[model samples]
Target: MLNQELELSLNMAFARAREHRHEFMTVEHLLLALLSNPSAREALEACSVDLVALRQELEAFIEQTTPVLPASEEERDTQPTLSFQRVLQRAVFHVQSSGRNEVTGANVLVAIFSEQESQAAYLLRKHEVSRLDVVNFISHGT
Candidate 1:
């Protein structure tokens, strides 16, 4: 089970995607939601990310790229893109392997890095934040 904080962000991601009628719930959608997540925001800020700027770019990218569901399909649920599912699965694996009972946002962020093809990972990489950086920060609190 996702910890409460992480659960909120995940729910927000799905809600945001549904509100916009996006055909697929991409990491870009999840990334935006993570800004409000405590652990994720802490890790991102530690990386010296311009949070607001990152927010702008994500909104811009998602707005321009998302395929809008047609009005006729308004009843259809937003679907998860492959990496969306993959990231969650990877995070769960990491937590279970590490003997953690709760999956946090930092764990989710770390999982995002393995999916380098994702826009969410690409966006953070653009800020020069590496997977190692996140792992070290989360592990060492530096």
Candidate 2:
């Protein structure tokens, strides 16, 4: 089940997305919307994920690789990067892939980013993700 805070965050995000007519809600967008929540922001800050740094990285990656741009060597070098799902999976994998047993978010996060990267997210089960929430999150944010 979705937590109340996360649900409220998602609802507000969707409302913003709808106002702007955004077609989809990328993780970055969700993060941005989440910033409005003090608890969420504090959590991210605790992880040392400077929002500016994270955003800059995302913009650089998007600009260099988004399909609209002409193909280039730099783009090629970065192009094989994992899809969103794999990225999320890798996140989960990082937490659990190395343990004596199963993979999980806690293992992936601690193993991958040492709380810095992990701090920025209140990770949830990706499979349980509501498609409508995602769609609503994006479209509504518009």
Candidate 3:
């Protein structure tokens, strides 16, 4: 049986996955949930995790990686936007498969945009986002 903290982590992770309509848990979703939850706020603040900065970095990364999707003849006029969520999913998968548990905001942030290592370092210095807080929120976020 899992311990209390572990149970909380799984629940929170599942909640994150469900919120994003994802069938599987990803650290990005989990980090977002953690940022939005009150219980996790303290750890985040204590760690200096700034959600605003994180978002800015992610957005900047998006701008840098903006790709020209092959357009269909009929859809040539439309702008193709890449979803941050998809990038996040891939990042989370990479991190999880790499063997870390309880998803830290730092870990998730880095995973989602590993190419932007500089931004990842900034995130690490700014937020605490403890493993327990993440686990708790995933299981109990409203």
Tell me how many clashing residue pairs each candidate has. 0, 15, 10
Residue lDDT tens for model 3, 8-78: 64466555444433333333334444454444444456546676776566445433543333433343222
* Better-scoring candidate (lDDT), 1 or 3: 1
lDDT of 1 by residue, 1-142 (tens): 6999999998888888888888997777877888889999999888888989889998999999998889884557789888788888999988888566888998888888888788888888887777787898988752
Residues 1-142, model 2: lDDT tens digits: 2335545765775675455444444454444555555444444455444556555654454334334423333322112223323434554544344433333222222222222232223232221222233333322321
As a TM-score, model 3 comes out at 0.31
TM-score of each: 0.92, 0.37, 0.31
Cand. 1 Cα-lDDT? 0.85
Using TM-score, give the best candidate's number.
1
Clash count (model 1, backbone only): 0
**Deviating ranges (above 4 Å) for candidate 2:** 48-142
Given candidate 2, what's the lDDT at residue 133? 37
Which runs in model 3 stand beyond 4 Å of their true positions? 1-48, 70-127
Error of 3 at 92 (Å): 14
